[PDB]
Amino acid sequence: GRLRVVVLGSTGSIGTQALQVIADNPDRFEVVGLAAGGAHLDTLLRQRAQTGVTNIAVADEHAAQRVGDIPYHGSDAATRLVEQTEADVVLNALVGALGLRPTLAALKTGARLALANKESLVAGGSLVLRAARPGQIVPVNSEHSALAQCLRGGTPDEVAKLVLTASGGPFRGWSAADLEHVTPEQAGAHPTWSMGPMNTLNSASLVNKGLQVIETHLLFGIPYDRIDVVVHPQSIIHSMVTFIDGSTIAQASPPDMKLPISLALGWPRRVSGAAAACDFHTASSWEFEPLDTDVFPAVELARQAGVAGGCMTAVYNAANEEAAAAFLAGRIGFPAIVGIIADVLHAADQWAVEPATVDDVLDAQRWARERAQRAVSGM
Amino acid sequence: GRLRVVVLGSTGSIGTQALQVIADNPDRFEVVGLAAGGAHLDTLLRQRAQTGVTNIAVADEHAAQRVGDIPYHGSDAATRLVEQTEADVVLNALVGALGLRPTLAALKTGARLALANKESLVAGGSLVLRAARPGQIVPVNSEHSALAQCLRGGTPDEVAKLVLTASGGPFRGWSAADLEHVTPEQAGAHPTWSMGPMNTLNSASLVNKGLQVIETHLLFGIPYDRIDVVVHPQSIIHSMVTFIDGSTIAQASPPDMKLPISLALGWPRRVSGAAAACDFHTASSWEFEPLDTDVFPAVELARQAGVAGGCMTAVYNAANEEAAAAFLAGRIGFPAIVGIIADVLHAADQWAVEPATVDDVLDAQRWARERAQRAVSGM
Numbered sequence: 001g002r003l004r005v006v007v008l009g010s011t012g013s014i015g016t017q018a019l020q021v022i023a024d025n026p027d028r029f030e031v032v033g034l035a036a037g038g039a040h041l042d043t044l045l046r047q048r049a050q051t052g053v054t055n056i057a058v059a060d061e062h063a064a065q066r067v068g069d070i071p072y073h074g075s076d077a078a079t080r081l082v083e084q085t086e087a088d089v090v091l092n093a094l095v096g097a098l099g100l101r102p103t104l105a106a107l108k109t110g111a112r113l114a115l116a117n118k119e120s121l122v123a124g125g126s127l128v129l130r131a132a133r134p135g136q137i138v139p140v141n142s143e144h145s146a147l148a149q150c151l152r153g154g155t156p157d158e159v160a161k162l163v164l165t166a167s168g169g170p171f172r173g174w175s176a177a178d179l180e181h182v183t184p185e186q187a188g189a190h191p192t193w194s195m196g197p198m199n200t201l202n203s204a205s206l207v208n209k210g211l212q213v214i215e216t217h218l219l220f221g222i223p224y225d226r227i228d229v230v231v232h233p234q235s236i237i238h239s240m241v242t243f244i245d246g247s248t249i250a251q252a253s254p255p256d257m258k259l260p261i262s263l264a265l266g267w268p269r270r271v272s273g274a275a276a277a278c279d280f281h282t283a284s285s286w287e288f289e290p291l292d293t294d295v296f297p298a299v300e301l302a303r304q305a306g307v308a309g310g311c312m313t314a315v316y317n318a319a320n321e322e323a324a325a326a327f328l329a330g331r332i333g334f335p336a337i338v339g340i341i342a343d344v345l346h347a348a349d350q351w352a353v354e355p356a357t358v359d360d361v362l363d364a365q366r367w368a369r370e371r372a373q374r375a376v377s378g379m
Numbered sequence: 380g381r382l383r384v385v386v387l388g389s390t391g392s393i394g395t396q397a398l399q400v401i402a403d404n405p406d407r408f409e410v411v412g413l414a415a416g417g418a419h420l421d422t423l424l425r426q427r428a429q430t431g432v433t434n435i436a437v438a439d440e441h442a443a444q445r446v447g448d449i450p451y452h453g454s455d456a457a458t459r460l461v462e463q464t465e466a467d468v469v470l471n472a473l474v475g476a477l478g479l480r481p482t483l484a485a486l487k488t489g490a491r492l493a494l495a496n497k498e499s500l501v502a503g504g505s506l507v508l509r510a511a512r513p514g515q516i517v518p519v520n521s522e523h524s525a526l527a528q529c530l531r532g533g534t535p536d537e538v539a540k541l542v543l544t545a546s547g548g549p550f551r552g553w554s555a556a557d558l559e560h561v562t563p564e565q566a567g568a569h570p571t572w573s574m575g576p577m578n579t580l581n582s583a584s585l586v587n588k589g590l591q592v593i594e595t596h597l598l599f600g601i602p603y604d605r606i607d608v609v610v611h612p613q614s615i616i617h618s619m620v621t622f623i624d625g626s627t628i629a630q631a632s633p634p635d636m637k638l639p640i641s642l643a644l645g646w647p648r649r650v651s652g653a654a655a656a657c658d659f660h661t662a663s664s665w666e667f668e669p670l671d672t673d674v675f676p677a678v679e680l681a682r683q684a685g686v687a688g689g690c691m692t693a694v695y696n697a698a699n700e701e702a703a704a705a706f707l708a709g710r711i712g713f714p715a716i717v718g719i720i721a722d723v724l725h726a727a728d729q730w731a732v733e734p735a736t737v738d739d740v741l742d743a744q745r746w747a748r749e750r751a752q753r754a755v756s757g758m
C-alpha cells in the first residue's frame with residue numbers, strides 16, 4: 001500500500017512541500033525520482049542526500065555536468081526519467097510549456113498524474129485528455145482540489161455550477177485608470193500565498209484565474225457558462241459546487257498547499273495531519289464579492305478561448321507568457337498583458353483545429369509567441 | 380421512480396412545507412398517509428379534500444367526533460396508520476412525546492424514516508437506535524442535513540470533527556449581566572401563527588443547539604468531544620465537517636427548510652429546484668465567532684447528559700421544557716432556565732440506565748419535570 005512517487009520540479013515550492021509530505025508519510029509514499037532545471041543545485045543536492053534518490057533528471061546540461069553522475073540530462077531529461085522509472089504517481093510540478101511532454105509521458109505509463117503544471121492541460125487540451133484514463137489526472141492546485149472534494153456532495157447530473165474563488169489580487173477594487181501605473185514590484189506580493197514572479201503576476205492580472213477556469217472545464221467537463229468566479233479576499237474557501245436543489249458544498253482550510261498536495265498524491269484517501277484545520281475557536285470572516293469583469297476581463301477572455309477550443313487555450317497561455325515576460329522586463333505596462341491577450345486571440349482564427357500531435361500544440365504556441373511579440377513591438 | 384410518503388404532523392410547519400415539495404414534484408413523491416393532532420382538524424380536512432388522501436389519522440378523539448369518517452382516531456392513531464399503510468418514506472414531523480411510538484412503528488415497517496421529531500432521538504435514544512438499521516433514519520433539520528451532505532467528503536474513518544453552526548440567538552454577545560434583564564418578548568416570544576413559543580426560546584437559550592448536539596451524536600456516531608459549535612449569525616453555512624487531513628467541507632444556502640426537507644424525502648437523491656442557491660453576484664460575508672460557554676453553558680450540559688447516557692438526555696430535555704415554560708410564565712428569570720437544567724441533571728444519575736421500553740423514557744421525563752417544578756417554585 002506504499003505509492004512510488006516521481007517528483008518533477010522538485011526544487012520549487014510545490015516540489016519541496018510534496019517532499020515534506022512524503023517525508024512525513026513513509027507509510028504512504030516513497031520518492032523514486034526527482035527532476036529539476038539546474039538553477040538551484042544546492043537544493044537538489046540536499047534533496048538527493050536527504051531522500052537517497054539518485055534517479056535524477058536535470059534540464060540544464062552544464063548544471064548536470066557541474067553535479068556529475070546525473071542519469072538524465074538535457075531538455076528531455078524529465079520526460080525520459082518518467083518513461084524509465086516505475087512509479088504509481090507522477091507529480092508534475094514543472095513550470096511552463098516544458099511540463100507538456102512529461103505530462104504525456106506520465107499518462108502513457110498508467111501512473112496517476114498529480115498535476116500542478118497547468119500549462120500542460122491548458123495548452124495540451126484534448127491531446128492530454130485523449131491520453132488520460134478517467135480519474136488519472138488529479139489536480140494539485142487548491143481550487144481544483146476543492147472542486148473535486150465538493151463534487152462528492154452529489155451525483156454528476158446533480159451539478160448545477162462550479163464556483164471558483166479568487167483572492168482578487170493586489171489590485172482588487174482598483175479602477176482601470178490606476179492599473180496603468182502598476183510596477184513589476186507592486187504586482188510582486190500576494191496576500192495569502194508565496195509564489196514565483198510569474199505565478200504571483202498571474203494572480204494580479206487574473207490570468208491565473210482564467211487559466212484555472214480552462215483547467216476546470218478540462219478536468220471536470222462542465223461547460224464554461226456553468227463555471228463561475230467569485231472574489232474571496234481571504235482565500236479560506238478554495239472553491240464550491242452548487243447543486244440542482246440549491247445546496248452549495250464548499251471546501252475550506254487555512255492556505256497551505258500541503259493539503260491539496262497530499263490529497264493529490266493519496267487520492268482518494270486523505271492524509272492524516274497534512275495541514276492545520278480552520279480554527280473555529282477564534283473569530284473569522286469569509287467575504288465574497290463579484291469580480292469586476294470590466295477592469296479584469298481575463299477570465300471571460302479565457303472562456304472565449306476555451307469555447308473556441310482546439311489550440312486556442314494554448315494561444316491564450318503562450319500569449320500570456322510572452323506579454324508577462326515583457327511586463328517583468330519593463331517593456332510594457334500592466335493593462336497591456338490582457339490587452340495583448342485579447343489582440344492575439346482575435347487574430348488566432350486558424351488555431352481552433354484540435355491537435356492531433358504535440359507538434360500541433362507546439363505550432364500554435366510558436367505562432368502565439370510571435371504574434372504576442374509583434375503586439376509588444378507596436379507599443 | 381415514485382416514493383410513497385406518509386406525512387405525520389401534516390398541519391405543522393415542516394409537514395405543510397413537505398406537502399408543498401410533494402405537490403411540486405408528483406414524479407418523485409406521492410402522499411399515501413396523513414396524521415395530525417386534532418387542534419388543526421380543519422386544515423387536515425382541507426388536506427384530505429386537496430390531496431384526495433382518505434388514509435388519515437387524528438389523535439384527538441374529541442376532535443374526531445366532528446367528522447365521522449376518520450379511519451384512524453384516538454391515541455396511537457398515527458402508530459396504527461403507520462403499521463397499516465404501505466409506504467417507502469415516513470416523514471415524522473410530530474411534536475414531542477407522541478412522535479416516539481410512530482418512529483418505532485415506522486422503523487419496524489422497514490420504511491425510510493425522514494425524522495423531524497426531536498423526542499425520538501433526544502428521549503428515545505438507544506430504543507430508537509437499536510430499532511433502526513443503518514441509513515434508515517434520514518434527518519430533516521438543516522444542521523443535521525448539512526452534516527449528512529458534508530460527510531460525503533470522506534469515509535467515516537476520515538472524520539475528525541463535526542461543527543454545528545448556531546445563529547447565537549437574539550442575545551448573541553450579551554454578558555451574564557445583560558441576560559438578567561431578559562423578558563419573554565425579548566426572547567422572541569410572540570403569538571406567531573406557526574412558530575411554537577418553545578423553539579424560538581430554545582434558540583435564545585442555546586438549548587436547541589444542545590439538543591442538536593445530542594442528535595448529531597446519535598445520528599452520526601461521533602464522540603461528544605469531537606462535536607463542536609460555532610456561532611454564525613448569517614445562517615448561510617448550516618454546518619461543516621473537518622476531516623483528518625485538515626480539510627473542512629461546509630454546506631451553504633439561503634435559509635429555506637424546503638431544501639433539507641426535499642433531500643430528506645428523496646435521499647440520497649437531490650430534488651431539482653427545491654430552494655434558491657447562494658447568489659454571489661452581490662457582496663456578503665459569512666462570520667464566525669466562538670460561543671461564550673460561560674454565559675451560554677447549555678451545549679456543554681447537553682454533552683454532559685449525552686456522555687452520561689441512557690435516559691439523561693430525556694432528563695435534559697424535560698427539565699428544559701419545564702424551566703422554559705416557567706420563564707415564559709414570568710416565574711423565573713432567563714438565566715435560570717439553563718441553571719435549573721444543571722441542577723436537575725446533577726441530581727439525576729439514577730437515569731443513566733439504558734431504557735428497555737417507552738415507559739422507562741416516560742418515567743425519566745416525569746421525574747425531570749417534577750424536579751424542575753420544585754426548583755422553579757422554591758421547593
Ligand SMILES: NC(=O)C1=CN([C@@H]2O[C@H](COP(=O)(O)OP(=O)(O)OC[C@H]3O[C@@H](n4cnc5c(N)ncnc54)[C@H](OP(=O)(O)O)[C@@H]3O)[C@@H](O)[C@H]2O)C=CC1
Binds near residue numbers: 014041119
Ligand atoms: N505554488 C503554488 O501554490 C501554485 C502553483 N501553481 C502551478 O504549479 C506549477 C509549478 O510552479 P511552482 O512549484 O508553483 O513553481 P517554482 O517556480 O517554484 O518551481 C518550478 C520548478 O520547475 C523546475 N524547472 C524550471 N525550468 C525547468 C526546465 N528547464 N526543465 C525542467 N525543470 C525546470 C524548477 O527547477 P530549478 O529552479 O532548479 O531550475 C523548479 O523546481 C506552475 O505551472 C504553477 O502554475 C498553480 C497555482 C499555485
